[PDB]
Design a binder for this molecule. Structure first.
Ligand SMILES: O=c1c(O)c(-c2ccc(O)c(O)c2)oc2cc(O)cc(O)c12
Ligand SMILES: O=c1c(O)c(-c2ccc(O)c(O)c2)oc2cc(O)cc(O)c12
Ligand code: NI
Ligand code: NI
Lengths: 183, 183
């Protein structure tokens, strides 16, 4: 049931748009980025570039790098574990909430955010899209695509140069110095 | 905190875009259609009409009426129970798969589809959008908005005049003529 695409020599996402398809649990296109596994079930080529659908799952760990997107809206829908989401609104106040499976978090464009996984193997459902396309392939770009199944045994830490060549390709703006005012 | 919006007197989706928000499990805008509960956590007003985010849960039931979307792509991502997805491709080849939690189904536009829920209280995470915009307010339109939590105690059966008016507003082609071979 395997295809070959511009993204993977082995994929369960067909290369031709307008094709119905199913993908079993965990078999979307995969990518590592630090301790986490990102799995892509649908990309821009599936939806005339209107949206995507992916999951992000990883071990108990520290708050990911603060960042924003300018033309992209994000969804955080927890399916496993517990994840803490940090958002900063346009005015400037910062809110956090431990999101348990079934809970939902929305981060609008130009809003600074970050998430922390507070249970082992937590999992988040994600959508990331907007006016100027979908940004699913960001993860395998900054990080690495992976043929392995499961969590990375060891974090994939990108060499620092990736943090420049990529942000000007994937609508993402890191804020290496950021604060979080709530604990 | 509850807001008033153009869709609900009481809602956890803010009325104004650019505002980040959290919603607790089950507390999105709710709708009933047949025996199914649809819960909206994000609509077009949140993402500049690019995408939405909703869940669909219901009792073990019959196959929903077969239908198609001219300009809308559908995600089926199963979170509870098990859901059998029926799709017909553009070339007339029908396809059937039982989707268990973590499995993913994709229905591209113009593809005739229908789902059957095969465990009590199965749950599907959906996204329905395309070039034309987002689809979410369809369910409360064909069916009804709902203030209660939990599954409809008894199914909401829309008037046949709703079956005529709604497609003129939402992007749904009902197919009472369609036969599913696969089985
Ligand atoms: O930029 C990032 C981003 O957008 C997401 C993300 C994850 C899950 C979602 O559901 C979502 O909408 C977004 O994760 C990240 C994880 C990192 O380690 C580093 C990042 O830069 C991002
Ligand atoms: O047209 C319909 C539709 O699209 C969906 C749906 C459900 C879950 C999803 O995840 C999704 O993307 C779509 O349900 C329906 C249920 C009905 O009783 C009648 C319908 O006409 C639809
Ligand atoms: Ni982000
Ligand atoms: Ni449909």
């Amino acid at each position: 049931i395997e295809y070959a695409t511009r993204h993977r020599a082995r994929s369960f996402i067909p290369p031709e748009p307008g094709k119905p398809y199913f993908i079993e649990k965990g078999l979307g296109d995969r990518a590592h980025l630090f301790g986490d596994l990102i799995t892509i079930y649908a990309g821009g080529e599936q939806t005339e570039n209107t949206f995507n659908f992916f999951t992000c799952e990883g071990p108990k760990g520290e708050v990911i790098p603060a960042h924003s997107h300018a033309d992209t809206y994000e969804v955080f829908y927890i399916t496993q574990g517990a994840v803490r989401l940090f958002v900063e609104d346009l005015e400037g106040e910062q809110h956090e909430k431990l999101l348990t499976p079934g809970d939902f978090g929305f981060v609008p464009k130009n809003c600074v955010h970050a998430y922390r996984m507070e249970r082992h193997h937590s999992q988040v459902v994600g959508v990331a899209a907007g006016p100027g396309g979908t940004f699913e392939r960001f993860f395998e770009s900054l990080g690495t695509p992976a043929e392995e199944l499961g969590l990375p045994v060891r974090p994939f830490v990108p060499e620092p140069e990736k943090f420049r060549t990529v942000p000007e390709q994937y609508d993402v703006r890191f804020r290496p110095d950021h604060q979080w005012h709530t604990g």
